[PDB]
């Protein structure tokens, strides 16, 4: 009971977008990808409301290799990218992150979307109040006490030093000078300084990194002017408008 639209050719580049909208990001990515590549896949989710046949739910990736390569399954796509919008698709995220970790551990391009504004009991010499709100996990009203332990693998917490150290557990005391793979940070609507502090404390900039945060903080709620301005400078960050 879900609709999905895909169009891949010669396995160019499969991009999954979970309900997008008209924005400046498209006006910037369209010309770029059109000049850099061609015959790219335009896989986008379609609004349901009435049953049809089956349901994707991230399993569509496996479905493709299972249906098209029914004769024999060698190996699916490696660079999986999940796009969408901020909301709370913890179920979808669970499916994605789960399939990725059980599909291919040495992932090269990972994207952390819908990152929660809460951490998970981590001690850092960032601020005297850092470790206070850190383990408080409230933000002014968070009754997801039964979900925070799941969000670590179904939402992707902003504490990457805790995430990898919880899954792989091969993280050392020092996390500096670590730059090689690709990872995008999309979320942290309230705590924007967290990714700036912990992200810069290691002074490590990978070959490809991108930080796109929103604005749910009271200051953006009251002064929407700031929220709009932040988005403007964010979209015009890679390329300035004429």
């Amino acid at each position: 009971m879900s609709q999905l639209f895909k169009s891949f050719d010669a396995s160019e580049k499969t991009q999954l977008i979970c309900f997008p909208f008209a924005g400046g990001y498209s006006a910037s990515f369209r010309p770029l990808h059109a000049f850099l590549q061609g015959e790219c896949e335009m896989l986008a989710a379609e609004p349901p409301g009435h049953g049809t046949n089956q349901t994707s739910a991230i399993e569509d990736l496996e479905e493709l290799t299972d249906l098209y390569k029914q004769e024999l399954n060698l190996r699916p796509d490696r660079p999986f990218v999940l796009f969408g919008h901020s909301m709370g698709g913890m179920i979808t995220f669970r499916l994605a992150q789960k399939l990725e970790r059980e599909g291919i551990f040495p992932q090269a391009v990972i994207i952390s979307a819908i990152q929660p504004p809460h951490i998970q009991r981590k001690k850092v010499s960032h601020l005297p109040d850092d470790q206070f709100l850190d383990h408080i996990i409230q933000l002014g009203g968070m009754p997801a006490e039964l979900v925070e332990n799941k969000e670590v693998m179904s939402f992707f917490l902003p504490s990457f030093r805790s995430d990898y150290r919880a899954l792989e557990q091969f993280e050392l005391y020092d996390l500096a000078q670590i730059q090689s793979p690709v990872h995008v940070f999309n979320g942290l609507d309230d705590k924007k300084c967290i990714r700036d502090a912990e992200g810069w404390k290691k002074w490590a900039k990978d070959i490809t990194f991108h930080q796109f945060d929103g604005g749910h903080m009271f200051l953006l709620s009251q002064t929407e002017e700031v929220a709009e301005r932040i988005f403007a400078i964010l979209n015009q960050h890679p390329i300035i408008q004429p």
Partner: protein
């Protein structure tokens, strides 16, 4: 009160298609819809989505007025303030 299987449950917009995953899949499960229930009337919720309301309405305290049940076109809000 009126928790019977609703024969009217379909997301008007694509954005609303995610609501069934967030709430119905956990708090609901009964099979209700936009036909008045223990959620349509409003509540404090049980997920982190409550933050988006409490912080956007600047402390609702009692009723979450002008934060969700005020705009039928949610997609029009998402294309403005994320």
């Amino acid at each position: 009160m009126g928790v019977t299987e609703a024969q009217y449950v379909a997301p008007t917009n694509a954005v609303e298609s995610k609501l069934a995953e967030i709430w119905e899949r956990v708090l609901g499960v009964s099979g209700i819809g936009i036909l008045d229930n223990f959620f349509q009337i409003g509540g404090h919720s049980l997920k982190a989505m409550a933050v988006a309301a409490q912080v956007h309405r600047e402390y609702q305290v009692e009723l979450p007025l002008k934060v969700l049940f005020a705009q039928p076109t949610i997609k029009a809000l998402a294309q403005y303030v994320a």
